[PDB]
Design a protein around this ligand. Structure first.
Ligand SMILES: CC(C)(COP(=O)(O)OP(=O)(O)OC[C@H]1O[C@@H](n2cnc3c(N)ncnc32)[C@H](O)[C@@H]1OP(=O)(O)O)[C@@H](O)C(=O)NCCC(=O)NCCS
Ligand SMILES: CC(C)(COP(=O)(O)OP(=O)(O)OC[C@H]1O[C@@H](n2cnc3c(N)ncnc32)[C@H](O)[C@@H]1OP(=O)(O)O)[C@@H](O)C(=O)NCCC(=O)NCCS
Lengths: 141, 147
C-alpha cells in the first residue's frame, strides 16, 4: 500500500529518481547547485521532508526548508500523479512550516504549469515572477 | 587481485537509475552543466542505459561508481563518475576500461568525450590514452581515443 514517511539521508537516490521523472517543472540551470550531494543532504536534514512509497516503489517526495520558508521540492512520478500524493505531501510540509513558526511560505514554479493551478487550488497566490522567470507563489498563516 | 574484493561490478540496467543520479551528484568536479540537464530526464537517461554500454560499481553494499558508453548519436563516453570517498581505488579506470573495450569490440573506430578543461578527469583520460582535440560549443575539452 501507499505509505508516507519522513525523508532521510538514505532516500537521496530516490529523491533524484522522482525529481527527474517529471515532465513539467524540469530542472532549470539556476537550480542545479541544490542537487549537489552536500546541499541536497543539508536540505533533507532540515527535517521538513516526506517521501511516499507505493509498495517498494518510490512515488513522490516533498520537502520544506528555512534558508526563508520555502517549498524546496514537490514531485510525483507521472505514473502516480492524480492520486492525492502531491496534496498529501504538500499538506504535511505546509503544516510543518507553520508549526516551525513561519508566517508565510514561498515557492516558485513554471508559469502556467499544471503545478501552478494545483498550488492555487490549495490556497497559494501568485505574487509575481522571479529573475529567472519563475512564478512566485505565497501562502500565509 | 588488483582491486579489493569488496568492490564488485554489475551491468548497468534501468533498476540502477536512482544510483546513477546519486553517484553523478556526489562529485565535486565536472558538475552538471545547463546543456546536460536534458540527458538526466528519466526517459532520456533510461534510453542511454538501454544502449547497453554501462556498468555500475559497488563498494561493499554502497554504490560507488558508474560509467557508460553510447553509440548513438556517435561513439561517446556518456558518463563516468565515482563518489569522492571511493576515488583513487581503481574504480574509474576499471569502468573506463570496461566501457572502452565494449565499444571497440562492437565496432567503434574512435570514441569521443567532453570534460571540463583542466579538470582532474582531463589528465586521467590522457593518462589512459585519450587526446585533447579541441573544444566543443560550450568550451568543454573534447577528447578522442582511436581503435
Ligand atoms: C504538481 C504535482 C506535485 C501534483 O501532485 P499530484 O499527486 O499529481 O496531485 P493530487 O493528486 O494530490 O491532486 C490533483 C487534483 O487536484 C485538483 N487540481 C489540480 N489542479 C487544479 C486546478 N488548476 N484547479 C482546480 N483543481 C485542481 C484536481 O482535483 C486534481 O485531480 P485530477 O488530476 O484527477 O483532475 C504533481 O502532478 C507533479 O509532480 N507534477 C510534475 C512536477 C511538478 O510540476 N512539480 C511541482 C514543482 S514546483
Ligand atoms: C575522474 C574519475 C572518474 C577518476 O576515477 P578514479 O576512480 O578516482 O580513478 P582511479 O582510481 O581508477 O585511477 C586514478 C589513478 O589514475 C592515474 N592518474 C590520474 N590522473 C592522472 C594524470 N593527470 N597523470 C598521470 N596519471 C594519472 C593515477 O595513477 C591515479 O592514482 P591516484 O588516485 O592514487 O593518484 C573520478 O575521480 C571522478 O569521478 N571524478 C569526479 C567526476 C569527474 O570528473 N568525472 C569525469 C566526467 S567527464
Amino acid at each position: 500500500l501507499i505509505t508516507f514517511e519522513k525523508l532521510t539521508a538514505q532516500h537521496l537516490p530516490y529523491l533524484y529518481e522522482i525529481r527527474f521523472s517529471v515532465e513539467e517543472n524540469l530542472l532549470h540551470p539556476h537550480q542545479i547547485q541544490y542537487l549537489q550531494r552536500r546541499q541536497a543532504l543539508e536540505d533533507i536534514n532540515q527535517g521538513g521532508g516526506w517521501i511516499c512509497k507505493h509498495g517498494d516503489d518510490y512515488a513522490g517526495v516533498g520537502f520544506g526548508l528555512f534558508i526563508e520558508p520555502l517549498i524546496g521540492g514537490l514531485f510525483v512520478k507521472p505514473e502516480y500523479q492524480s492520486k492525492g500524493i502531491g496534496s498529501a505531501l504538500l499538506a504535511r510540509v505546509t503544516a510543518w512550516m507553520f508549526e516551525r513558526g513561519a508566517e508565510a511560505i514561498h515557492l516558485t514554479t513554471d508559469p502556467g504549469s499544471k503545478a501552478e493551478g494545483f498550488y492555487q487550488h490549495h490556497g497559494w497566490a501568485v505574487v509575481g515572477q522571479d529573475e529567472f522567470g519563475q512564478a512566485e507563489l505565497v501562502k500565509r498563516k
